[PDB]
């Protein structure tokens, strides 16, 4: 099995059960709401809801944010299969996950992303799927840069043949000429600040409005 | 040895070196700036800098924020010993760390917190030290609630005999009568939202202004 596309919850090894509380909240959201767009993935999704203005660009679109810090692809897959696509009929599902798949090869993470697009195509066949490219990370050149770039090539070539699956690279050019990422964009060289969110989100908003 | 008070960097098992980039940035901050207050600890410290308005309450105070998501006590201890207290002479150092010490007993985390106050008293003997109580976490009652409460009793009783060491519980009462924490306060039942930061930070600002 590709471990990236084998659905599995995050096991609580800390004791406060917060991942499963998050999941149950999103399930109840889906039971009770009628979104047109659902956002799912890791803390880049999750933190957009606070840390960026989601209210001005995305709230009008009738959007649920189901981001969980730390999730890998298999975690998202599990969540989509275990209640978060129930009782809804979005027009669009936005997927942003894969940068936390540590210990998986790029091909494996790509296999994880392809399994999420497949699940969404089966459980919510009317929806378009948007997959965001994995962003660069690390202050200087490093192997996760090259990993996430390779994921992005492989995913883009996989989605090229899919009428209603869209690859979006939302990277404005966070890697500079000197090879560096600025902490003004990414305060810890991976998570975006308000400034790093702005151009990402407006690339996303523009794609969403054409589609919608 | 108490593992909580044995200084040690976070080892990079991912490959992009971001923890050590963060540390080097803070070292350069300390070389080049002249803060009156330095904030150090985990992502509750770190995210206050974006996620709350640090600008209105804390920026006037000439404050550096040296928070790193995921740090335990021994990580903070290492950082304070390995350059982040160099070239400065703060009036106040604010410590908020211990909630990530998974696998350490409450007594051990307390031993970690006491070693950080001791380091700061030796390297920056003029500064007052403020230690923030560990906040509750988890949506419902769970063993990390009781752990962090016990840490807070033990730390408060340790700092009671210290003229210029101050324990501050900044918890407004995030645990409700029904036993629950609201996701309006803590979006993932551990990290604060803008709303959860407001009362925390104004408790902190008030203590700082008396002292200062």
Curated annotation (Swiss-Prot), chains A, B:
Top-level enzyme category: hydrolase
Disulfide feature: none
Keyword annotations from UniProtKB, A to Z: Acetylation, Cytoplasm, Hydrolase, Lipid degradation, Lipid metabolism, Phosphoprotein
Molecular function (Gene Ontology), one example: protein heterodimerization activity
BP-aspect Gene Ontology terms: lipid catabolic process; spermatogenesis
Activity regulation: Beta subunit (PAFAH1B1) inhibits the acetylhydrolase activity of the alpha1/alpha1 catalytic homodimer.
Reaction it catalyzes: a 1-O-alkyl-2-acetyl-sn-glycero-3-phosphocholine + H2O = a 1-O-alkyl-sn-glycero-3-phosphocholine + acetate + H(+); 1-O-hexadecyl-2-acetyl-sn-glycero-3-phosphocholine + H2O = 1-O-hexadecyl-sn-glycero-3-phosphocholine + acetate + H(+); 1-O-hexadecyl-2-acetyl-sn-glycero-3-phosphate + H2O = 1-O-hexadecyl-sn-glycero-3-phosphate + acetate + H(+)
InterPro entries referenced in this protein's UniProt entry, alphabetically: SGNH_hydro, SGNH_hydro_sf
Other remarks in the entry: Originally the subunits of the type I platelet-activating factor (PAF) acetylhydrolase was named alpha (PAFAH1B1), beta (PAFAH1B2) and gamma (PAFAH1B3). Now these subunits have been renamed beta (PAFAH1B1), alpha2 (PAFAH1B2) and alpha1 (PAFAH1B3) respectively.
Family: Belongs to the 'GDSL' lipolytic enzyme family. Platelet-activating factor acetylhydrolase IB beta/gamma subunits subfamily.
The protein, known as: Platelet-activating factor acetylhydrolase IB subunit alpha1
């Amino acid at each position: 099995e590709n471990p990236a596309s084998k659905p599995t919850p995050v096991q609580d090894v800390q004791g406060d059960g917060r991942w499963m509380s998050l999941h149950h909240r999103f399930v109840a959201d889906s039971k009770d709401k009628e979104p047109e767009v659902v956002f799912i993935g890791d803390s880049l999704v999750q933190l957009m809801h606070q840390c960026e203005i989601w209210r001005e660009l995305f709230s009008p679109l009738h959007a649920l944010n189901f981001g969980i810090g730390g999730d890998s692809t298999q975690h998202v897959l599990w969540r989509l299969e275990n209640g978060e696509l129930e009782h809804i009929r979005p027009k669009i599902v936005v997927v942003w996950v894969g940068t936390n798949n540590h210990g998986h090869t790029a091909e494996q993470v790509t296999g994880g992303i392809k399994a999420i697009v497949q699940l969404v195509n089966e459980r919510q066949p009317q929806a378009r799927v948007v997959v965001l490219g994995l962003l660069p990370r690390g202050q200087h050149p490093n192997p996760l840069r090259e990993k996430n770039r390779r994921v992005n090539e492989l995913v883009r070539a996989a989605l090229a043949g899919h009428p209603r699956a869209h690859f979006l690279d939302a990277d404005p050019g966070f890697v500079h000429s000197d090879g560096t990422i600025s902490h003004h964009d990414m305060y810890d060289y991976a998570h975006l600040s308000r400034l790093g969110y702005t151009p990402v989100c407006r690339a996303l908003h523009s794609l969403l409005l054409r589609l919608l």
